[PDB]
Amino acid sequence: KTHVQLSLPVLQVRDVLVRGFGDSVEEVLSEARQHLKDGTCGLVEVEKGVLPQLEQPYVFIKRSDAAPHGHVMVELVAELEGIQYGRSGETLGVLVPHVGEIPVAYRKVLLRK
């Protein structure tokens, strides 16, 4: 399928144990897609002071359209030293590996895969 319904655990930035997916734009987008497929991906909501506590390159989920079955349609955009790789809508948050952290909420998304 071109799109997959996922429910992403929303993590507090200070709880996150693994603060990024890797060391290159291509690797972080690759790893993010793998963890999303494997159900091992969490979401951190971006506010003041969140991104400097996470590791670059960043992987964002961004709204790709204006929400089947409660699932907002999203796509992946990476960022490294202020340059983004992709073009999409509003940021829903930054993806990180999930290694068993307790979430504060779940974000239902429809991921363009």
- Provide the CATH number for the domain around residue 69: 2.30.30
3-state SS, 2-51, equals CEEEEEEEECCHHHCCCCCCCCCHHHHHHHHHHHHHHCCEEEECCCCCCH
Range of the domain at 19: 3-112
- As a whole number of angstroms, the distance between CA 78 and CA 33 comes to 12
> Amino acid identity of 24?
S
Structurally, the chain folds into a number of domains equal to 1
| Six-digit token string for 62 | 């961004």
3-state secondary structure of 53: helix
